[PDB]
Amino acid sequence: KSCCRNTLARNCYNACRFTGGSQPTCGILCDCIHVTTTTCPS
């Protein structure tokens, strides 16, 4: 349920997940967060 600060960080996150990274890992490595709601903070 991912949320990233910009598109460079977004690509970071998707590639991280695809090559085996857990949610918390990918959030840490790509400066992203996970929410239980339908939208992210600006």
Complex with Na ion: residue 6 or 22, whichever CB lies closer: 22
Contacts 24+ apart (CB under 8 A), 30-39: 30/4, 31/4, 31/5, 32/2, 32/3, 32/4, 32/5, 33/2, 33/3, 33/4, 34/1, 34/2, 34/3, 35/1, 35/3, 36/1, 37/1
Complex with Na ion: residue 20 or 41, whichever CB lies closer: 20
Question: Which one of Na ion, Cl ion, none is in contact with 27 (Cβ closer than 5 to 8 A by kind)?
Answer: Cl ion
Pick one of 6, 11, 15, 24: the residue that binds Na ion (CB under 5 A).
24
Residues near Cl ion (CB under 5 A): 21-25, 27, 34
